[PDB]
Design a protein around this ligand. Sequence first.
Ligand SMILES: Nc1nc2c(ncn2[C@H]2C[C@H](O)[C@@H](COP(=O)(O)OP(=O)(O)OP(=O)(O)O)O2)c(=O)[nH]1
Ligand SMILES: [Ca+2]
Ligand SMILES: [Ca+2]
Ligand SMILES: [Ca+2]
Length: 341
Amino acid sequence: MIVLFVDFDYFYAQVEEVLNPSLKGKPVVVCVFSGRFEDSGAVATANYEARKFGVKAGIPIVEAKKILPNAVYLPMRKEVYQQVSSRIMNLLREYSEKIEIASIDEAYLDISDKVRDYREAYNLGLEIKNKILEKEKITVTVGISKNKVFAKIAADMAKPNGIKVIDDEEVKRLIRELDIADVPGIGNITAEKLKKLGINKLVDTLSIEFDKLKGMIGEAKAKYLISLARDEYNEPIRTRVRKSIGRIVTMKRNSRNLEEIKPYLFRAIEESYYKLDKRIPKAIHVVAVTEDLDIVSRGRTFPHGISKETAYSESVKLLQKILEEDERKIRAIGVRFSKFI
DNA sequence: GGGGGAAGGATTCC
DNA sequence: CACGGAATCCTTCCCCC
Ligand SMILES: Nc1nc2c(ncn2[C@H]2C[C@H](O)[C@@H](COP(=O)(O)OP(=O)(O)OP(=O)(O)O)O2)c(=O)[nH]1
Ligand SMILES: [Ca+2]
Ligand SMILES: [Ca+2]
Ligand SMILES: [Ca+2]
């Protein structure tokens, strides 16, 4: 089997560079202002002109302007990027019936019934790149390997706007030389727990008794790495469907006053419903971020669908439950609707 | 003993 | 920090055969 992964380059920023070409070459930073205090907020992403100086996703906008005080800062317009993405995905379909969308800029494609041998795949990659570049003026990176995991990795390497195949012979090479940390699904928390077990390389996951390895990093994550190390990972590509829709927002200032937090909440709810399009959720969760950037949530599942009127009512209670259970001040508030019918 | 869920949270990632 | 959004796995408690 052969898998081709697609990972659009610095997406949000490039989509802005495409809508306003006068940007190209310049340092571009797509921001997410919270309204808290002037320039307060994070960075969704940035183009490579800005990335060359540390300005990346996650860091505070303020920390960015310190580095590049003259870079171009644009507010994140998720909706617009969403549509562009949609199209690009629709385009890929005409390359394989088997397609799995991992995010707003990631998709796997099983070209087993289209290509034979990697060379033909590598060419199909270029055939796709040029196609995308032409139709939407958007460069992307393509990773090719036997399974989704290695395909993604291959991509990570070729970045930006590149292509790369990982033949079975090299696959074995990575299981030993490749850093365990860089393996998809291995954040800081996990990588560290592995650093102790002594597992610094993928292959090392074979020098530990399943139980200890399992009891340390969960059963699922355990079997996961073990199959990858044994060179037997082979998850199929499938059409995933949104399991939930939500909306969150940072208040002008921390709070614990029911009436002061309500307005924000009702807005998240009001919007989350519109987002629902024509979906009817059976579960409603109220998420809250305390003064120390912590997250607590209380929800509830019903035997029937939830109406907007019901969302309002219930949402209040859950928020009340939160307050009387956490003395901390609430920095942000929002909702989450799941368990659609 | 163990299936069955629900809920609250931990983790990873875009 | 300093934002949003979302999936998956995990621990835990609760009801019952
Ligand atoms: N709002 C928000 N967006 C994020 C965050 N992290 C990543 N994103 C955005 C960046 C892109 O718009 C999209 C895809 O993430 P990548 O990790 O693919 O970012 P980018 O497009 O720069 O990929 P690239 O490194 O150029 O290959 O998700 C985040 O923490 N907050
Ligand atoms: Ca990506
Ligand atoms: Ca990307
Ligand atoms: Ca990692």
